[model samples]
Target: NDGFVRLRGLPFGCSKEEIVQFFSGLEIVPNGITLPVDFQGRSTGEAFVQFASQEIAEKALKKHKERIGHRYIEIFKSSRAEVRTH
Candidate 1:
């Protein structure tokens, strides 16, 4: 139950589908995945990604964090909560 991964600094125009796709290629633990959308119902350039195990989460963080993307993607831990206003 110690598996938890969160990613931040997503692209401004990233969508939930994109988020899923981005992490889908990584080692994600089954039944331990949680990706929450932001205030704009979009990626919000941040997301809460959880893994089934801590090891997987840590591994993913280490490998994916600070990695550049097609659009110069930046990934990091999120210090803010996921809040969306209507």
Candidate 2:
């Protein structure tokens, strides 16, 4: 029973849709993941990615972590909870 995962270092102004599109064609466990936009529509330059299972979530984290992007995209699990006050 895995919980939500997070992806960091996404380009500033990146949208939830964009994150989804980026990881569309992958071998995800299936359902159970949600990509949510952070506060102010542009904060932390990160996206919260949930996974179906802990295994899948860990796999994704390992596979994409430290992987550089066109703009140095760094993916990893979130350290803290995402809290929004609005």
Candidate 3:
């Protein structure tokens, strides 16, 4: 479970069910996912996802150019010591 990733570019206030459904094609079900928000509860354009390992991460990487709503999402490799759960 060492491969974790960060992301942005989904519609703010999207439902977790949809987010989960969005990644259903990956080898492993995501440990979890969240759309971070600002003080006003507006999405700050940040997302969090954890993968089982780098191999699983590749599935997501190939999906980087996908459009969640009107925009293609952004993906980046992040570490446990770096980003905390929101």
Candidate 4:
């Protein structure tokens, strides 16, 4: 539980499938990836992904500062509520 993670600086127009690929080798929950949008429905360069467990989430943190399509992404542990509310 508590396996939610926040991803920032994602490439603009990044797709859900791309997120799955970025997190390849991880046990991401079905339909567990979400990309936040602005009030105008524009991409916000941010995302939240839920893993199978806390350890998995911790492992995901290792991907912090990793690049996705030339844009470096920042990863941080996040609560499910944060993901839900965003």
Model 3: colliding residue pairs: none
Query: Candidate 2 on 1-86: residue-level lDDT in tens?
Result: 44356665666666555665565643344443343444643445555565655665666665464433454445666422552321
Query: Which whole-number lDDT from 0 to 100 does residue 58 have in model 4?
Result: 89
| Candidate 1 lDDT over residue span 1-86, tens digit each | 45455555666665556655666656544443344444552445555665555665565666464433554344444322432211
Per-residue lDDT of 1-86 in model 4, one digit per residue for the tens?
77999887877788887788888898998878876556322244778899989888888899888777888888888988897676
Clashing pairs in 2: none
* lDDT for each residue of candidate 3 in 1-86, tens digit (9 for 90 to 100): 55667777667776677566666766444455745556333354577767667677767766775777776777777666555734
Error of 4 at 80 (Å): 1.0
TM-score of each predicted structure versus truth: 0.51, 0.54, 0.73, 0.87
Q: Mind sharing the TM-score for model 1? A: 0.51
RMSD of each: 5.1, 4.6, 2.8, 1.9
Ten contiguous residues minimizing lDDT sum, candidate 3: 35-44
Clashing pairs in 4: none
lDDT of 4 at 34: 75
lDDT of each: 0.51, 0.52, 0.65, 0.81
Which is the winner by TM-score between candidate 3 and candidate 4?
4
Clash count of each predicted structure: 4, 0, 0, 0
lDDT: which candidate is best? 4
Q: Rank the candidates by TM-score, best first.
A: 4, 3, 2, 1
